[PDB]
TrEMBL record, chain A:
<comment type="similarity">
    <text>Belongs to the spectrin family.</text>
</comment>
<feature type="coiled-coil region">
    <location>
        <begin position="39"/>
        <end position="73"/>
    </location>
</feature>
<comment type="function">
    <text>Spectrin is the major constituent of the cytoskeletal network underlying the erythrocyte plasma membrane. It associates with band 4.1 and actin to form the cytoskeletal superstructure of the erythrocyte plasma membrane.</text>
</comment>
<protein>
    <recommendedName>
        <fullName>Spectrin beta chain</fullName>
    </recommendedName>
</protein>
<comment type="subunit">
    <text>Composed of nonhomologous chains, alpha and beta, which aggregate to form dimers, tetramers, and higher polymers. Interacts with BCAM.</text>
</comment>
TrEMBL record, chain B:
<comment type="similarity">
    <text>Belongs to the spectrin family.</text>
</comment>
<comment type="function">
    <text>Spectrin is the major constituent of the cytoskeletal network underlying the erythrocyte plasma membrane. It associates with band 4.1 and actin to form the cytoskeletal superstructure of the erythrocyte plasma membrane.</text>
</comment>
<protein>
    <recommendedName>
        <fullName>Spectrin alpha chain, erythrocytic 1</fullName>
    </recommendedName>
</protein>
From TrEMBL, chain C:
<feature type="domain" description="Class II aldolase/adducin N-terminal">
    <location>
        <begin position="27"/>
        <end position="209"/>
    </location>
</feature>
<comment type="similarity">
    <text>Belongs to the aldolase class II family. Adducin subfamily.</text>
</comment>
<protein>
    <submittedName>
        <fullName>Beta-adducin</fullName>
    </submittedName>
</protein>
Length: 113, 35, 280
C-alpha cells in the first residue's frame, strides 16, 4: 500500500512540476499594450492570473500533506520525497517572486502614464 | 454595471476549471486492491 | 594498434534493469562521449554529459568516474539518483563517485524541459568564462548561439542556499549558462540540440579568442546589433544523423536509429537456381 501511494506521489508531482515550468515560460515574456487602456487591461489580466494561481497553491499544499505522510510512516526512501517536495516549494516561491516583480513593473508603467 | 457582469464570470470560470482538473486527476488511478 | 571499441554492448550484457526507452538513450550519450573525445575537447572524466531518462522516474544516466571518454560504452554507464545514490550500476568495476553530478542536480531541480546537460572545460571556453564582459557577438556563430546567462561559481554547490542563487541566475528560459572561471554549460531538450549548441559556442569562442588577441581592443572590432540580428528539421536532428552514419561507415556499432534510409538500393540481378537463403 505504501509503495502504491509513493508511485501516486510521483505521478501527482509530475503535473505540478510541468505546470510550474509552463507558467515560468509564460510569465517570462513581457508584451505591454500601447497607451493606458491596454496597459490597465494587461494589469487586470495579470490580476486574473494571480487569482488563478491561488487555486493551485491549495493543491500544492495537498501534495505537501501527502508527502509528509510518508515521513510520518517512515518510508524506506526519505531523501527522494523530501528533496522533490522542497524543490517544488522553492520553485513555487520563485514563481511568486516573478509575479510580484511583473506586478511592480506594471504599476511603474501605470504611474508614469 | 457592465464590468461586474464580466468579472463574476471571471471568478467562477477559474473555479470550474480547477474543479474539473481535480476530478480529472482523482479519477484515472487504476485501483486493483483485493477482495 | 586501435582505439576502436563497439559502442553497443547491450546484446553481450543481457542483464540489468532497464526502462522502455533507456537502451537507446544510453547509446546516444555514449555516442556523444565519442564525438567529444574525437574532436579533442576532453579526454579525462569530469562528468561532462548528463541525461534524464524519464520525467517521472528520474534515474539520470552519468559516466563512471575513472573511465576516459574514449573507453566509455553503452553498458558502462551508471544510472544515479538526484541526490547521488546509486539506482543501477552497469558492468564497470570502479569505485562510485557522484560528486560531479551535484553541478547538474540543481539544474535538474530547476528546469525539467531539459534532458541533456553538457559541461565543458576546454581552454577557449574557460578563457571566455574568465572573460569579464562574456561572449561578445562579433561572429555569426555567436549570433547563432542565442542568449546567455552568467553565474558566479565558488566551486561548491552542496550548500542549500547556493542552489537558490544558481537557479535564480539561470532564469526561466535560457539554455546556455556561463560559470565564471569554470567553462560553460549547455542545456538541451534533446542531445542533438545540446550538441549543436556546444559545437557552435565552441567555434564562436575559438573565433572570439583570436579576435580579441589580434584586435587588442573592442573598438578595433565590429559588432552587429542583437536587435538587428533579432520538412521541419529539429535544431540538431540533421547533423547528428550524418555523424552517426559516418561512424557506422567507419565501424562503430552506433545504435542510433535513422529516420530515413541512405541509399536507394536498386534491385540486383537475380537467378532462379539460387539455393534459398537464411538458416531459419
Amino acid at each position: 500500500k505504501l509503495e502504491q501511494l509513493a508511485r501516486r506521489f510521483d505521478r501527482k508531482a509530475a503535473m505540478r512540476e510541468t505546470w510550474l515550468n509552463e507558467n515560468q515560460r509564460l510569465v517570462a515574456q513581457d508584451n505591454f499594450g500601447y497607451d493606458l487602456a491596454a496597459v490597465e487591461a494587461a494589469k487586470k489580466k495579470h490580476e486574473a492570473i494571480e487569482t488563478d494561481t491561488a487555486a493551485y497553491e491549495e493543491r500544492v499544499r495537498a501534495l505537501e500533506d501527502l508527502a509528509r505522510e510518508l515521513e510520518l510512516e517512515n518510508y524506506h526512501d526519505q531523501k527522494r520525497i523530501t528533496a522533490r517536495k522542497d524543490n517544488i516549494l522553492r520553485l513555487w516561491n520563485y514563481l511568486q517572486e516573478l509575479l510580484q516583480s511583473r506586478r511592480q513593473r506594471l504599476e511603474t508603467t501605470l504611474a508614469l502614464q | 454595471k457592465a464590468e461586474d457582469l464580466f468579472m463574476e464570470f471571471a471568478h467562477k470560470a477559474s473555479a470550474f476549471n480547477n474543479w474539473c482538473e481535480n476530478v480529472e486527476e482523482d479519477l484515472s488511478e487504476p485501483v486493483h486492491c483485493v477482495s | 594498434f586501435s582505439m576502436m571499441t563497439p559502442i553497443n554492448d547491450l546484446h553481450t550484457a543481457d542483464s540489468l534493469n532497464l526502462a522502455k526507452g533507456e537502451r537507446l538513450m544510453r547509446c546516444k550519450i555514449s555516442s556523444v562521449y565519442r564525438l567529444l573525445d574525437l574532436y579533442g575537447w576532453a579526454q579525462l572524466s569530469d562528468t561532462y554529459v548528463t541525461l534524464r531518462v524519464s520525467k517521472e522516474q528520474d534515474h539520470f544516466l552519468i559516466s563512471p568516474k575513472g573511465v576516459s571518454c574514449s573507453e566509455v560504452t553503452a553498458s558502462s554507464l551508471i544510472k544515479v539518483n538526484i541526490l547521488g545514490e546509486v539506482v543501477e550500476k552497469g558492468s564497470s568495476c570502479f569505485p562510485v563517485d557522484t560528486t560531479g553530478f551535484c553541478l547538474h542536480s540543481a539544474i535538474y531541480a530547476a528546469r525539467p524541459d531539459v534532458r541533456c546537460i553538457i559541461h565543458l572545460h576546454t581552454p577557449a571556453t574557460a578563457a571566455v568564462s574568465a572573460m569579464k564582459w562574456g561572449l561578445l557577438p562579433v561572429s555569426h556563430n555567436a549570433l547563432l548561439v542565442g542568449d546567455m546567462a552568467y553565474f558566479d561559481f565558488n566551486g561548491e554547490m552542496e550548500q542549500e542556499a547556493d542552489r537558490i542563487n544558481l537557479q535564480k541566475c539561470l532564469g526561466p528560459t535560457c539554455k546556455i549558462l556561463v560559470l565564471r572561471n569554470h567553462g560553460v554549460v549547455a542545456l538541451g531538450d534533446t542531445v542533438e540540440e545540446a550538441f549543436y549548441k556546444v559545437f557552435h559556442l565552441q567555434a564562436a569562442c575559438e573565433i572570439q579568442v583570436s579576435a580579441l588577441s589580434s584586435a587588442g581592443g573592442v573598438e578595433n572590432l565590429i559588432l552587429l546589433e542583437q536587435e538587428k540580428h533579432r520538412q521541419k528539421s529539429r535544431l540538431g536532428e540533421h547533423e547528428f544523423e550524418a555523424l552517426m552514419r559516418m561512424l557506422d561507415n567507419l565501424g562503430y556499432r552506433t545504435g542510433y536509429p535513422y529516420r530515413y534510409p541512405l541509399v536507394q538500393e536498386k534491385t540486383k540481378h537475380k537467378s532462379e537456381v539460387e539455393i534459398p537463403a537464411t538458416v531459419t
